[PDB]
A paper describes a structure:
Whereas protein transport is generally facilitated by karyopherin-β family proteins, mRNA export in yeast is mediated primarily by the Mex67:Mtr2 complex or in metazoans by NXF1:NXT1 (Segref et al., 1997; Braun et al., 2001). Mex67 is a modular protein containing four domains: RNA-recognition motif (RRM), leucine-rich repeat (LRR), nuclear transport factor 2-like (NTF2L), and ubiquitin-associated (UBA).
After refinement, the model had a Rwork/Rfree value of 21.8%/27.7% and excellent geometry. In the C. thermophilum complex, the Sac3 helix also had a “kink” following residue 1,137, possibly as a consequence of the greater distance between the Cdc31 and Sus1 chains. Density for ctSus1 residues 99–139, as well as its substantially longer N/C-terminal extensions, was not present, consistent with these regions being disordered. Importantly, the extensive interaction interfaces between Sac3 and both Cdc31 and Sus1 were preserved. For example, ctSac3 Trp1161 was analogous to scSac3 Trp802, where it is a central feature of the Sac3-Cdc31 interaction and is buried in a hydrophobic cavity in the Cdc31 C-terminal domain.
Residue numbers in the entry:
A (entry chain C): 13 to 96, 136 to 159
B (entry chain A): 6 to 176
C (entry chain B), D (entry chain E): 1090 to 1170
E (entry chain F): 13 to 99, 136 to 165
F (entry chain D): 5 to 176
Write the structure that this text describes.
């Protein structure tokens, strides 16, 4: 019930029509939660959260950030620098995301 | 943001000798290292000794704006705000600004809390007697009785915060 | 190929990886945030127990009590006629 | 009359009245002297324990300990080379 | 008994041999002790000792005097001068003096006799 | 006869350092609870004891009679006893100055030795240095304090006695 239509290949490709369509259909018989679950359970083994927490802690300890939203913005900004101890999410769970999302996206 | 800049002294100069002596006193107290320099937390304490309990944000702003790097730090590398220190000048200027910016009511509220330790909400004769015992000087009970009775407008047997502030700010 | 489409879908801008990492960071950071708060409570409490501070505090207390007590008694004496 | 002679003897220089007054003063004054010593011990004791002096004392102790401790440690590290 | 020498009347008179002689005779088969008793007993009622003690106290409390001998010399001088002026004063009351006259008189009457020229 | 009420000289107060003058003013202001700028006899005694002077009553009494000023409330037509006289800041400053400048440097050191060694053991050990470290608040590595003891322990007794303490603290 879903046609790729050359699938908008580039990782940077900015398509929201297809994305909101697929996401909307996918939300029915929700899969988002399955991905989230599998990912956390597969996210903790690599030892990333401790890195993140220690960084956030340092940020709070220095006193540079003094509110949770600011801490969130600061840290999300920091992790975002995947391209640059790295706060980048391990490639393993990315491959896992690829697998499970592919599997759950194959059905549609 | 401009950074490492020395703070202005204009708000420190208009102080009296007593105050300046108290600042220097606090500094010298918390200056255990004797290097004429304070750590961040020592500076926080120095301000807390003057009766300022500022939030981390404000002291951190002070830290980045007016914090000087330590000597041991290699100049070829960047220094984080937290590892910076305060000379006497910065502490003086900052404390001065803080003091002249201070609302006159704060010290009085603090004092009211010092007199009324039980948190009853008012100062009674007994409290004044305890404080008298703390000061060391013995005052006749007529005086303290007059200290309460003259300013008690409710006949409650003590003086509340409002009355304390009003009587203490009155000319 | 579906694999390419899912690749774009998951690691693209507004991808699943982004929403996920954002969410997990939100909750994780809240946890460590509360942790830091508790730690600060304890650190302040233990920091307060330092002697230098106790001295600064006591000295201040005494000074204030003296000042405002005698001021108060002065007002009282004035009104007493 | 004997009374005149007694008068000379008692109210004379080196009379019994003189030696008497001297002795009674000796003993009475020694008593009150020891008394005063004990009173001073207790009064000083009670005068010491209270705040103002305690603040001055604590301040003194701290200042001295700081000064000579760090001075000492300086000597030590200096000697360690 | 002892034959006397016409008593050298004026209180400030100089002869000291007769005085020490009389004292020597008096200490032997002691009578002096009676004087001491009668005097103490009659000295405490006028309330003089408390005054003396209080003065000594003031002197010690001020810190003006810091040794017992100095305290003694001071108080002795003080009573010397108050006694000089009298004719709260530390002068010894006249009552006990009169008492001294009486008791010393009886003792001397028993002990000695005074010849007549 | 004795001269009385005379003001004391500042010559011995002037050559002092800022620290000393400030500490004197601190002591004065501390024990000046009435805030009248004047001290009683005992308040002044305490002010001197705050500087670390345990003078005998005789000396402070001499100071009192020589440099004690009558209070204002006292009737000027009658004599006031020495004990009722008071000390302004100037007198306290002058007297304290003389006392400080005349004092031998060993006294403060002996006192300090008693402060470090409170148990009266006769020597200062590592534990004492550790306690003092705890009192000050600063944490120093045990190598330093171990060196603070060992470098100056000439007997191998496990501490530093008074003589050694003075000798080392007075050393150039």
């Amino acid at each position: 019930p879903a046609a790729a239509a050359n699938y908008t290949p580039a990782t940077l490709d900015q398509d929201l029509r297809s994305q909101i369509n697929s996401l909307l259909i996918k939300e029915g018989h929700v899969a988002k939660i399955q991905e989230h679950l599998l990912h956390h359970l597969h996210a903790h083994p690599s030892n990333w959260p401790t890195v993140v927490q220690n960084h956030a802690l340092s940020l709070l300890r220095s006193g540079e950030v003094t509110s949770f939203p600011a801490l969130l913005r600061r840290v999300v900004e920091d992790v975002r620098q995947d391209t640059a101890p790295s706060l980048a999410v391990p490639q393993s769970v990315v491959e896992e995301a690829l697998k499970v999302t592919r599997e759950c996206l194959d059905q549609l | 943001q401009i950074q490492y800049t020395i703070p202005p002294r204009e708000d420190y100069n208009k102080l009296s000798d007593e105050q300046k002596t108290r600042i220097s006193e606090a500094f010298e107290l918390f200056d255990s290292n004797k290097d004429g320099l304070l750590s961040y937390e020592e500076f926080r304490f120095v301000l807390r000794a003057l009766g300022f309990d500022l939030p981390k944000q404000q002291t951190y702003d002070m830290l980045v704006r007016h914090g000087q790097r330590p000597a041991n730090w290699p100049h070829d590398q960047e220094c984080p705000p937290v590892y910076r220190q305060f000379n006497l000048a910065t502490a003086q200027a900052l404390a001065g600004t803080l003091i002249r910016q201070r609302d006159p009511r704060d010290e009085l509220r603090r004092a009211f809390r010092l007199f009324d330790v039980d948190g009853k909400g008012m100062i009674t004769e007994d409290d004044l007697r305890k404080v008298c015992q703390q000061v060391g000087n013995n005052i006749p009970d007529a005086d303290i009785q007059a200290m309460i009775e003259e300013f008690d407008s409710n006949g409650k047997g003590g003086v509340d915060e409002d009355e304390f502030l009003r009587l203490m700010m009155s000319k | 190929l579906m694999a390419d489409f899912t690749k774009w879908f998951v690691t693209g801008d507004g991808g699943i990886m982004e929403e996920f990492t954002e969410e997990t960071l939100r909750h994780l950071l809240w946890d460590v945030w509360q942790r830091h708060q508790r730690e600060e409570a304890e650190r302040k409490r233990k920091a307060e127990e330092e002697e230098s501070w106790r001295l600064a505090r006591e000295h201040l207390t005494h000074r204030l009590q003296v000042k405002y007590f005698y001021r108060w008694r002065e007002k009282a004496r004035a009104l007493a006629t």
